[PDB]
Design a protein around this ligand. Structure first.
Ligand code: CL
Ligand code: NA
Length: 129
């Protein structure tokens, strides 16, 4: 599923992302935008053999099991394929563990490079939330 901007903002709000660990809704929508282009099906292979899955491009090295990342962890206790569903529940539940992990949303390179210290509230203007 390719989410519309505001459609994704509402889903994320419902699932408890709005100001989760101090990060406004703008921050999560901005990251989804640049990580996956709001596409739940997005995958991208990393040089280290790991793969990024889903709308928030969660990595197989740490977070999920794809059965092909030798020496990796499954800290969200999920198949990576769960992260590719049109329901974003598992992506969002797994993002809460990640953002809690000490580096905050710095864990997401695109957020750090493209969202951080920009006007992130733009990403949710015109949305009825
Ligand atoms: Cl933080
Ligand atoms: Na893994």
């Amino acid at each position: 599923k390719v989410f519309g901007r505001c459609e994704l903002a509402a889903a994320m709000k419902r699932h408890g992302l709005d100001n989760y660990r101090g990060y406004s809704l703008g921050n999560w929508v901005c990251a989804a935008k640049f990580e996956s282009n709001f596409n739940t099906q997005a995958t991208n292979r990393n040089t280290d053999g790991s793969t990024d899955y889903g709308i928030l491009q969660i990595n197989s090295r740490w977070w999920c099991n794809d059965g092909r990342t030798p020496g990796s962890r499954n800290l969200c206790n999920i198949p990576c394929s769960a992260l590719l569903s049109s329901d974003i529940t598992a992506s969002v539940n797994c993002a809460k563990k990640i953002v809690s992990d000490g580096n905050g949303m710095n864990a997401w390179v695109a957020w750090r490079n493209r969202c951080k210290g920009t006007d992130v509230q733009a990403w949710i203007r015109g949305c009825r939330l």
